[PDB]
Write an enzyme that holds these catalytic residues in place. Structure first.
Site, PDB file in Angstrom:
ATOM      1  N   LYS A  29      46.499  40.505  18.888  1.00 45.28           N
ATOM      2  CA  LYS A  29      47.367  39.807  19.833  1.00 45.28           C
ATOM      3  C   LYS A  29      47.926  40.723  20.914  1.00 45.28           C
ATOM      4  O   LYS A  29      48.750  40.270  21.724  1.00 45.28           O
ATOM      5  CB  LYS A  29      48.517  39.117  19.088  1.00 45.28           C
ATOM      6  CG  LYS A  29      48.053  37.971  18.186  1.00 45.28           C
ATOM      7  CD  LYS A  29      49.216  37.084  17.735  1.00 45.28           C
ATOM      8  CE  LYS A  29      48.735  35.961  16.826  1.00 45.28           C
ATOM      9  NZ  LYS A  29      48.187  36.519  15.560  1.00 45.28           N
ATOM     10  N   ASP A  39      52.342  41.714   8.027  1.00 41.61           N
ATOM     11  CA  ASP A  39      51.088  41.738   8.779  1.00 41.61           C
ATOM     12  C   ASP A  39      50.925  43.032   9.557  1.00 41.61           C
ATOM     13  O   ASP A  39      50.725  43.016  10.773  1.00 41.61           O
ATOM     14  CB  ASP A  39      51.020  40.541   9.723  1.00 41.61           C
ATOM     15  CG  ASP A  39      49.681  40.423  10.440  1.00 41.61           C
ATOM     16  OD1 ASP A  39      48.630  40.759   9.843  1.00 41.61           O
ATOM     17  OD2 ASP A  39      49.702  40.030  11.632  1.00 41.61           O
ATOM     18  N   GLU A  63      58.421  36.696  19.521  1.00 45.28           N
ATOM     19  CA  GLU A  63      56.979  36.718  19.306  1.00 45.28           C
ATOM     20  C   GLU A  63      56.383  35.421  19.820  1.00 45.28           C
ATOM     21  O   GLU A  63      56.914  34.339  19.557  1.00 45.28           O
ATOM     22  CB  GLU A  63      56.592  36.862  17.830  1.00 45.28           C
ATOM     23  CG  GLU A  63      56.984  38.186  17.218  1.00 45.28           C
ATOM     24  CD  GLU A  63      56.462  38.349  15.815  1.00 45.28           C
ATOM     25  OE1 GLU A  63      55.501  37.633  15.454  1.00 45.28           O
ATOM     26  OE2 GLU A  63      57.029  39.186  15.083  1.00 45.28           O
ATOM     27  N   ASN A  84      60.146  33.338  16.634  1.00 45.11           N
ATOM     28  CA  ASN A  84      58.725  33.685  16.596  1.00 45.11           C
ATOM     29  C   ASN A  84      57.962  32.374  16.517  1.00 45.11           C
ATOM     30  O   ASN A  84      58.055  31.665  15.512  1.00 45.11           O
ATOM     31  CB  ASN A  84      58.389  34.567  15.389  1.00 45.11           C
ATOM     32  CG  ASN A  84      58.958  35.955  15.484  1.00 45.11           C
ATOM     33  OD1 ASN A  84      59.557  36.337  16.490  1.00 45.11           O
ATOM     34  ND2 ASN A  84      58.774  36.740  14.410  1.00 45.11           N
ATOM     35  N   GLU A 129      61.585  37.259   9.946  1.00 45.94           N
ATOM     36  CA  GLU A 129      60.848  36.176   9.297  1.00 45.94           C
ATOM     37  C   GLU A 129      61.153  36.093   7.803  1.00 45.94           C
ATOM     38  O   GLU A 129      60.266  35.888   6.967  1.00 45.94           O
ATOM     39  CB  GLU A 129      59.358  36.348   9.558  1.00 45.94           C
ATOM     40  CG  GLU A 129      59.034  36.153  11.053  1.00 45.94           C
ATOM     41  CD  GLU A 129      57.615  35.755  11.286  1.00 45.94           C
ATOM     42  OE1 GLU A 129      56.787  36.092  10.425  1.00 45.94           O
ATOM     43  OE2 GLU A 129      57.309  35.182  12.354  1.00 45.94           O
ATOM     44  N   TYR A 163      54.199  30.178  17.635  1.00 43.79           N
ATOM     45  CA  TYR A 163      52.780  30.280  17.951  1.00 43.79           C
ATOM     46  C   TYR A 163      52.208  28.909  18.276  1.00 43.79           C
ATOM     47  O   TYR A 163      51.223  28.454  17.698  1.00 43.79           O
ATOM     48  CB  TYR A 163      52.060  30.971  16.793  1.00 43.79           C
ATOM     49  CG  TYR A 163      52.443  32.427  16.712  1.00 43.79           C
ATOM     50  CD1 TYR A 163      51.821  33.364  17.532  1.00 43.79           C
ATOM     51  CD2 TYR A 163      53.442  32.874  15.836  1.00 43.79           C
ATOM     52  CE1 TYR A 163      52.172  34.705  17.480  1.00 43.79           C
ATOM     53  CE2 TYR A 163      53.795  34.213  15.777  1.00 43.79           C
ATOM     54  CZ  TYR A 163      53.149  35.126  16.604  1.00 43.79           C
ATOM     55  OH  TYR A 163      53.480  36.456  16.574  1.00 43.79           O
TER      56      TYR A 163
HETATM   57  C1  LIG Z   1      49.541  25.743   9.048  1.00 45.21           C
HETATM   58  N1  LIG Z   1      48.965  26.619  10.074  1.00 45.21           N
HETATM   59  C2  LIG Z   1      48.752  28.019   9.757  1.00 45.21           C
HETATM   60  C3  LIG Z   1      47.667  28.781   9.267  1.00 45.21           C
HETATM   61  C4  LIG Z   1      47.816  30.130   9.070  1.00 45.21           C
HETATM   62  C5  LIG Z   1      49.011  30.713   9.343  1.00 45.21           C
HETATM   63  C6  LIG Z   1      50.102  29.941   9.831  1.00 45.21           C
HETATM   64  N2  LIG Z   1      49.944  28.604  10.024  1.00 45.21           N
HETATM   65  S1  LIG Z   1      51.326  30.890  10.051  1.00 45.21           S
HETATM   66  C7  LIG Z   1      50.868  32.341   9.627  1.00 45.21           C
HETATM   67  C8  LIG Z   1      51.521  33.545   9.612  1.00 45.21           C
HETATM   68  N3  LIG Z   1      52.961  33.908   9.989  1.00 45.21           N
HETATM   69  C9  LIG Z   1      53.188  33.685  11.414  1.00 45.21           C
HETATM   70  C10 LIG Z   1      54.241  34.605  12.013  1.00 45.21           C
HETATM   71  N4  LIG Z   1      53.862  35.982  11.712  1.00 45.21           N
HETATM   72  C11 LIG Z   1      54.480  36.879  12.642  1.00 45.21           C
HETATM   73  O1  LIG Z   1      53.461  36.891  13.722  1.00 45.21           O
HETATM   74  C12 LIG Z   1      52.376  37.985  13.769  1.00 45.21           C
HETATM   75  C13 LIG Z   1      51.057  37.479  13.695  1.00 45.21           C
HETATM   76  O2  LIG Z   1      50.658  36.732  12.777  1.00 45.21           O
HETATM   77  O3  LIG Z   1      50.264  37.815  14.615  1.00 45.21           O
HETATM   78  C14 LIG Z   1      52.658  39.064  12.711  1.00 45.21           C
HETATM   79  O4  LIG Z   1      51.907  40.207  13.077  1.00 45.21           O
HETATM   80  C15 LIG Z   1      54.140  39.320  12.767  1.00 45.21           C
HETATM   81  O5  LIG Z   1      54.484  40.604  12.115  1.00 45.21           O
HETATM   82  C16 LIG Z   1      54.883  38.238  12.137  1.00 45.21           C
HETATM   83  O6  LIG Z   1      56.292  38.456  12.506  1.00 45.21           O
HETATM   84  C17 LIG Z   1      53.869  36.328  10.305  1.00 45.21           C
HETATM   85  C18 LIG Z   1      53.230  35.238   9.417  1.00 45.21           C
HETATM   86  N5  LIG Z   1      50.877  34.637   9.204  1.00 45.21           N
HETATM   87  C19 LIG Z   1      49.552  34.552   8.799  1.00 45.21           C
HETATM   88  N6  LIG Z   1      48.841  35.724   8.358  1.00 45.21           N
HETATM   89  C20 LIG Z   1      49.285  37.062   8.707  1.00 45.21           C
HETATM   90  N7  LIG Z   1      48.894  33.347   8.816  1.00 45.21           N
HETATM   91  C21 LIG Z   1      49.520  32.265   9.218  1.00 45.21           C
END
Ligand SMILES: CNc1ccc2c(n1)sc1c(N3CCN([C@@H]4O[C@H](C(=O)O)[C@@H](O)[C@H](O)[C@H]4O)CC3)nc(NC)nc12
Ligand SMILES: CNc1ccc2c(n1)sc1c(N3CCN([C@@H]4O[C@H](C(=O)O)[C@@H](O)[C@H](O)[C@H]4O)CC3)nc(NC)nc12
Lengths: 589, 589
Positions: free
Chosen positions: B559, B164, B495, B458, B404, B460
């Protein structure tokens, strides 16, 4: 029959809008019969307005279920000599209305008017008016709510809209008390018109209650009588010599005055013709090119609530931009807006509340027994009520039966055929009918091809597909639209756009920027301008608007040409330039 | 061995950054051997910089494959008495380096330095320096690119990042020519330290080429010698009485001067200890609490390119905010940044390029024959090269092996165990090792539990799950984090965050607004502040940064606590307040 309430020599009009008492249902409001007494420990809420954004409370905004509105109603006793009627222009979504603890009427459907007489015997020296308002949506409502369609358990039960706009609820449009004579009064007025040389023949049907004599007269704006027929019964016709026709951006309204007994009513009326002929959409026998938008009724902080200064501002912006039309996406709009569009010359595609009729985005149109959508009965009622309300508007040129239903699936034709038949039976003017088509891989199987007079397409080439690849968007756009163009019938865009956050910029194609919005539209027009049968462009959307929360909604929907406070993005200026160079008639002749 | 090039009494340092010739490969650049002649019909490109955002061309920005950089290299003939070395601090992703049409070296890996001697016999009166730069990513690169992971056919083949952040490429960091004596010179310096009472013992290993005598001396900043050992060979140790320790936000650097033959080199060096003990992360034997961020190397318009004024600004903002640490997400950062963090007292978690090691977000860690990820060999090289470059930095307290990866799937332990073993073998200081854990339903099966000294998570809660339901976010956060807290080892957030567009506001919880960013963080801290083993909070992200285009990326990743031009959002002020009240040591003692 739902004539717009007006002040006349026979009819009082008393607006009951203002500050009302308001209480969230806590699960006991009906059991404890809150409607029988003054609401206790209540907040205050403006009426008309959606209630969701007035306060700062997420529990209020995201409430599930019922709320109670209430006000005092102390009316002059001598109105009891008249027939007294309470008109609710709209209560979203369902309503129960009480006077003094007696349930007077109920209503399903959040965007069309309803009314009830107040029985003389119920009226006391001091009265309480209580309105319970239900916000819940499911597979039986229009609009449709979902039911079961890193997982988490929500804190509270919430509505799950099957549509992309926020579920704003409350007493959306004015509440008014009006009167008519008791013994004899006008119930409905139906007008059609035919142009014979320069003389217009207006066919009328005047529905009345009671025994009296009916008269109709037609007057210019300046006040000159141009036709009059007395003691005419229910049906008849009259003629207007050298009639001035209502035209897009050049409105002309006559005043049609009706008398029945002591009852008197004035209806503004524009004379114009609408016909689809070949690949042409003819208004007054000339090939029209729609230039405009899908809109929403959406402003801050009233949500969906009637906002007459904004209605005037929006039309002004439309004329500034060179637009000539919009669609009432995705629900009937206020009568105040529709009457202003008649006065200002803005063409309207009048749409029902039927958005979300789609369970696969179990089959959508499976039998109700087997879990299919349960909306067809209410869908017929909405069509009936919408056409009853808006039939006489010159500005309404086409009915939209549904937005983005599951029309490529089996059973769709069977669901929609009775509804198109109903719309054509009930509209005295026999205007074109359409449904608004969802983007779909099997587009040649869209049942709109079997039903509609105009194919109205919602397409996002360059946004939901081919995002940031506008060269590919152009190719895929052309491939599909050359199919629709090959059918020989008029077709148009009713939605196309790209989320754009004002203030975000890049010289190099980048989604969500103001420049990408322009390039998205330029790419689509490269195709549509070459297609003979493409007779209209309505962008999504006129202005940014509120939606449910989610990862793809940057504080609501950002596809507006204008922001929510009506400021123009770069693409708004682009469309001002483009529409300044495209005529309303004869662009594709 | 990759000592940072410096100007010394034995070593010239000539920066070759500036304006270089630049040409996109058109598919014939190697076949037609562009590297043998002056580039024809070329653009100009600043070096160091990513090339993607310098111009206004999407074809340049979104280019797939190779580009050619070139400049003239007319060097003084008397440098031929010295060993002449070309150092590339970083070329993203892969490089081929030519002098006068002769291929001198190649390199894989976009974020770590490489160098080549220039053979005396190749140097002419006038020379051409050509660097071909490859931007392509796939299942064998770090970072990983996807290969096959309303459908549309893209216009051109493009990289498909499995990560990302935008795939910024080019000559990212400075190119320099330096010299050493020909006959005998210093190749590497390794320093470790032990605190015995108030005396520090520094163990040294000095790697050299050629035959000469080695000497080491240690000086205070003010210039007082505090230890010296001469004719010491390769390994040895010395002691510093009343040593001043390097502390977070209270840096102290000695100057370690090394001489070998005629060669002379000065290494700044801070003395400090790092140890994990129980649920504590001990720096100088005190329980540290990380306060900080995951960062990116990202500024406009140079993309990933070295930006020393912004490096200084960012540290200033970190100190203004009360932070003490950051992670080099998701690739080694510039040596200039790492040396500034030593000078300023900012603690660093040093991370490899291994992001995207995940084919199921075929199994990720299936055999290469059966389509599994092909990165393990290069992954070992990155670990080797990263530790070789950064081993002597006091500011580096922990190595992050991957971000990740698919660590909850079968084969993950087998993939990572050799890499953790390698990192612990090569780091002379034996610092803690971690991998950064992706959010995952089967979190108790995350192989980090078997490998890491610190669990770095990490998560969210309130963004990618429980969005706009922060009460549910708090409950789900607590349920999982109480598991990690039950293991007795230190764990932290590396994160957590929420996309926030500056200027968007609501008093009532609404994703993408500045207020929701604050409430998201408040909700998470309600849980983490109660958990004894939670020893650090690093937000995602320090600042908004560029990503690939897509429906969930509002012109990149939003973010940041700061915007891309380093302006504070509401949550930046929130964290200034919060971190002002949390000590660097002894918060959870
Ligand atoms: C079921 N619910 C859902 C729906 C959509 C998504 C998820 N769950 S989970 C996830 C995800 N991961 C989450 C963690 N992520 C990390 O966090 C940052 C960030 O996404 O802001 C990234 O910049 C950083 O480099 C990464 O270390 C990397 C990918 N990524 C993306 N698209 C990119 N979409 C989704
Ligand atoms: C395979 N590629 C992908 C990925 C994601 C999505 C699609 N394709 S398609 C689609 C979609 N439909 C597109 C058409 N749409 C209409 O357009 C407006 C709008 O979305 O802006 C709505 O406001 C308007 O009321 C609707 O009439 C209503 C739903 N809707 C949503 N989420 C909401 N996501 C997606």
């Amino acid at each position: 029959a739902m004539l717009y309430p007006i002040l006349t020599q026979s009819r009082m009009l008393i607006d009951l809008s203002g500050t009302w008492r308001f209480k969230l249902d806590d699960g006991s409001g009906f059991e404890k019969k809150w409607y029988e007494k003054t609401l206790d420990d209540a907040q205050l809420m403006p009426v008309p307005s959606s209630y969701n954004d007035i306060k700062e409370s997420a529990d209020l905004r995201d409430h599930y279920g019922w709320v109670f509105y209430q006000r005092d109603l102390n009316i002059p006793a001598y109105l009891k000599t008249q027939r007294i009627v309470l008109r609710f222009a709209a209560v979203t979504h369902s309503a129960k209305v009480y006077v003094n603890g007696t349930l007077l009427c109920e209503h399903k459907g959040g965007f069309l008017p309803f009314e009830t007489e107040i029985p003389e015997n119920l009226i006391r020296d001091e009265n309480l008016l209580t309105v319970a308002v239900d916000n819940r949506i499911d597979h039986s409502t229009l609009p449709v709510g979902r039911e079961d369609e890193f997982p988490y358990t929500p804190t509270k039960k919430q509505n799950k809209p099957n549509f992309d706009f926020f579920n704003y609820c409350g007493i959306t449009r004015p509440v008014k008390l009006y009167t008519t004579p008791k013994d004899a009064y006008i119930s409905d007025i139906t007008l059609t018109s035919s142009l014979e040389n320069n003389t217009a023949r207006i066919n009328y049907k005047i529905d009345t209650k009671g025994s009296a004599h009916t008269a109709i007269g037609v007057y210019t704006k300046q006040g000159v009588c141009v036709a009059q027929t007395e003691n005419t019964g229910t049906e008849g016709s009259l003629t207007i010599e050298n009639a001035v026709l209502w035209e897009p951006l050049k409105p002309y309204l006559y005043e049609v005055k009706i008398s029945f007994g002591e009852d008197r009513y004035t209806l503004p009326y524009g004379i114009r013709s609408v016909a689809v002929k070949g690949n042409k959409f003819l208004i007054n026998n000339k090939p029209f090119y729609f230039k405009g938008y899908g809109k929403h009724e959406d402003t801050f902080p009233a949500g969906r609530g009637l906002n007459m200064p904004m209605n005037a501002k929006d039309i002004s912006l439309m004329k500034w931009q060179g637009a000539n039309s919009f669609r009432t996406s995705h629900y009937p709009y206020s009568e105040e807006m529709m009457r202003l569009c008649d006065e200002e010359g803005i063409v309207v595609i009048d749409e029902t509340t039927a958005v979300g009729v789609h369970l696969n985005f179990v089959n959508t149109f499976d039998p109700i027994e087997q879990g299919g959508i349960r909306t067809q009965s209410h869908h017929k009622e909405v069509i009936k009520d919408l056409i009853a309300r808006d039939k006489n508007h010159a500005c309404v040129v086409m009915w939209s039966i549904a937005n983005e239903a599951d029309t490529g699936s089996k059973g769709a034709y069977e669901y929609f055929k009775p509804l198109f038949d109903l719309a054509r039976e009930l509209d005295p003017q026999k205007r074109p009918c359409t449904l608004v088509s969802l983007q779909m891989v099997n587009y040649k199987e869209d049942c709109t091809i079997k039903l509609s007079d105009v194919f109205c397409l919602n397409r996002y080439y360059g946004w939901y597909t081919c995002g940031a690849d506008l060269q590919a968007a152009e190719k895929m756009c052309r491939e599909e639209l050359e199919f629709w163009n090959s059918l020989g019938k008029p077709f148009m865009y009713t939605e196309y756009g790209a989320d754009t956050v004002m203030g975000l910029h890049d010289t190099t194609d980048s989604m969500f920027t103001e420049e990408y919005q322009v390039e998205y539209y330029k790419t689509n027009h490269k195709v549509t301008d070459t297609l003979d049968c493409f007779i209209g462009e309505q962008v999504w959307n006129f202005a940014d608007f509120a939606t449910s929360q989610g990862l793809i909604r940057v504080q609501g929907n950002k596809k507006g040409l204008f922001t929510r406070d009506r400021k123009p993005k770069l693409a708004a200026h682009y469309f001002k330039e483009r529409w300044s160079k495209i005529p309303d008639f004869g662009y594709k002749k």
